[PDB]
Structure formats: C-alpha cells, structure tokens
C-alpha cells in the first residue's frame, strides 16, 4: 500500500522479529518466549490483514 | 525499497489469506483436518513474517 501506512506496521514486525530472534539465540517455555511468539503472530497478522484490505 | 519488499509483502499477504481461509474452514473441518491446516498456516505465517522482518532488520543496518 502506502509508505506511511506500512511504516508503523513494518516497525512492529521488525521489533517482533528481532525479539523472536533473540529468544531463539538464547536457548541455542519462557514468558518472554510466549510473548515473543504472540507479538510475532500479532504483528504478522496485522500487516497481512492490512495488505489484504488495501487491495480492495 | 518497494522492489526489495514486494515479494516479501506478497508472501505475507498470501500466508494471511491462507490463514484466514483455514480459520473460515475450522467452523466445519474435522479436528484432525483443522490441526494439520492450522499448523501449516502457522508455519507459513511465521516464516513469511520472519523473512520480511529479517530483511527490515538488515536494511535498517544500512
């Protein structure tokens, strides 16, 4: 869609990815693991649903 | 950078449309069918989310 629409949704997904990656790098479950998984799923779905909605 | 992002966004959009389909189907799917589809929809959501997220992390590094 739009650069300004994306930005906050991309930011949330990047933070969720960076968190998930760090939770993964430390075990190589936790309340942090579950919050990271939930935040990753929630940011993925929010950006996916936003991409769906903007393509009419 | 929309050319770098477009294949990652398309992949995430499609995984979400599939996930939304698995959700609509769970109202009538047998529970064995649902667990399999949901696991598959979750794994595609995750790998699509992470592939775009890793690319945003790598591009923020500039």
UniProtKB/TrEMBL annotation, chain A:
Q: What does UniProt list as this organism's lineage?
A: Viruses, Duplodnaviria, Heunggongvirae, Uroviricota, Caudoviricetes
- Can you name the source organism? Pseudomonas phage DMS3
What this protein is called in its record is Uncharacterized protein
Top-rank taxon, per record: Viruses
Automatic annotation (TrEMBL), chain B:
- Report which superkingdom the organism of origin falls in: Viruses
Q: What is this protein called?
A: Uncharacterized protein
């Amino acid at each position: 869609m739009t650069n300004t629409d994306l930005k906050p949704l991309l930011d949330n997904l990047r933070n969720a990815t960076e968190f998930w990656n760090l939770v993964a790098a430390a075990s190589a479950h936790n309340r942090s693991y579950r919050d990271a998984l939930d935040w990753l799923e929630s940011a993925a779905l929010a950006l996916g649903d936003a991409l769906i909605a903007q393509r009419k």
